[PDB]
């Protein structure tokens, strides 16, 4: 789809996660943004290793009609606090609403 | 947020000997100033590519620009085959599309 007939519904992820290297017991933070010409009830998920991050804490961002325009705009970002050797594994974010599911780039985080 | 924006990326694709392919990207600008859109294949211009453009400004009376273009691509070729990029630029900035790749069967 396109802004011709407005038809872009499902979720465009417009920002990739990116591969990252932290210390154990940084913080540390992933994000994804995407951009949608629908209105309709977002979920952003987080998995780490192929498995969902049911606890993951998560900072969400809607910015719905931009400029007055028909553009929706999205920004998810992962919070890890205080990592450890077992938060090494590739991160992947899931953006869906009821029209499809956009799956991100595996982002690879490595604990030193 | 003068530059434009990328909201819909070309898809990668397959087709098939002597059909038509078309490559679509869209993008938004908080600035109604002149828009330049161009395609390219293998980092290579499109210099006389044939081009849907589409401009809606001030969509629904508000203050966002709206774009979308649309590479039409007739009768493909092996040659055809590649990877395909769009470039959309005003004066503040250009912004490039992720590679698209055309499989030619
Ligand atoms: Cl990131
Ligand atoms: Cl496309
Ligand atoms: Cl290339
Ligand atoms: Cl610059």
Known sequence: XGFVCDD????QITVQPETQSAIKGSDVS???SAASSSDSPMTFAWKKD???LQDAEMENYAHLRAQGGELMEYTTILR???VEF???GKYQCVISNHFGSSYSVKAKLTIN
């Open 86 to 88: 077992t938060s090494e």
């Open 30 to 32: 992933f994000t994804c």
């Open 50 to 52: 192929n498995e969902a």
């Open 8 to 11: 872009f519904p499902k979720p």
């Open 80 to 82: 890890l606090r205080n």
